[PDB]
């Protein structure tokens, strides 16, 4: 039997380098939620596996000009990996070209504030202009606002699209720094999972407020028609029912949190 090639992505806390990684080999180089999850999936499915970091560092999209899938999705579609174990969002266009398990983690768009900011909901943000707010320039959150027909989110998009200086940031680190350094006058819109992670990072000055604005899930992906997909999906369901997915989330977000 052959070693399963698992594509994954360097993204904290899902996959992170061990400090001594230069003196380590194979799967021992990495730690994180998806490292632990890969070991559990492999245990339940009965395979040996090698974690490999996706070469282009991307989740996966179809290039608008060439029509070629990149990222982990592309690794699956073009025969370079057997399974993707990563926070890969289950979307329509991806589901058409690869197979997904049921989701192992659910999430939604959410609001990050500096502690003390008088905001508790998206509606609160939308009905004022003293506190600026934005999102990742390249993110799925931006696209949610662009396409939304809900009055509150439409108003928020109209504000964000034309706000000056730009309220959009190039990276999560830029967004978080802007929240922390703006003295409560900038709020940041992002995935609840990342928001919750940052809430547990020093110096513990940010928090997540309000309910999620949408709902989506991260799934395990296999090439379309792969015989591995059935067992992997049953594994995700068993791990959820055993409490193990919740245990892993608690471990990497809270037991290992700094706040
Ligand atoms: N200098 C730079 C520097 C960075 C540039 C980036 C860039 C931006 C931001 C970040 C960053 O904050 N990462 C942390 C983060 C925040 C949210 N997630 C997340 C996203 C998922 C996902 C799971 C998660 C997680 F983790 F929450 F679970 N699962 C999916 O299934 C999925 O799909 N997504 C995407 C989505 O949901 O959105 C992760 C990292 C990068 C990067 O270096 O890869 C860049 C990206 C796209 C793009 N088209 C272009 S660009 O074309 O070049 O403009 C980009 O450019 C960049 C230039 S740049 O080129 O010089 O202008």
Author numbering: 10 to 268
Paper text:
α-Amino-3-hydroxy-5-methyl-4-isoxazolepropionic acid (AMPA)–type glutamate receptors (AMPARs) are the most abundant ionotropic glutamate receptors. AMPARs form tetrameric cation channels that are composed of GluA1–GluA4 subunits, of which GluA2 is the most abundant. Changes in the trafficking of α-amino-3-hydroxy-5-methyl-4-isoxazolepropionic acid (AMPA)–type glutamate receptors (AMPARs) play an essential role in synaptic plasticity, which is the cellular basis of learning and memory. Herein, we report on PFQX1(AF488), a fluorescent probe for the visualization of cell-surface AMPARs without any genetic manipulation to neurons.
Therefore, we used a ligand-binding core moiety of the GluA2 LBD, termed S1S2J, for the x-ray crystal structural analysis. The structure of S1S2J bound to PFQX1(AF488) was determined at 1.82 Å. In the structure, PFQX1(AF488) was recognized over a large area of the aperture of S1S2J. Specifically, the aromatic group of PFQX was stacked with Tyr68 (Tyr450 in full-length GluA2). The two carbonyl groups of PFQX, which mimic the α-carboxyl group of glutamate, formed hydrogen bonds with Arg103 (Arg485) and Thr98 (Thr480). In contrast to the PFQX part, the AF488 fluorophore part of PFQX1(AF488) was located at the vestibule of the binding cleft of S1S2J. In addition, the phenyl group of AF488 was situated at the hydrophobic region surrounded by Leu145 (Leu650) and Thr180 (Thr685). The main-chain amide group and the side chain of Thr181 (Thr686) formed a hydrogen bond with the carbonyl group of the amide group of the AF488 part. Of note, the negatively charged sulfonate group of AF488 interacted with the side chain of Arg179 (Arg684). Therefore, the x-ray structural analysis clearly revealed the molecular basis for the increased affinity of PFQX1(AF488) bearing an anionic fluorophore for AMPARs.
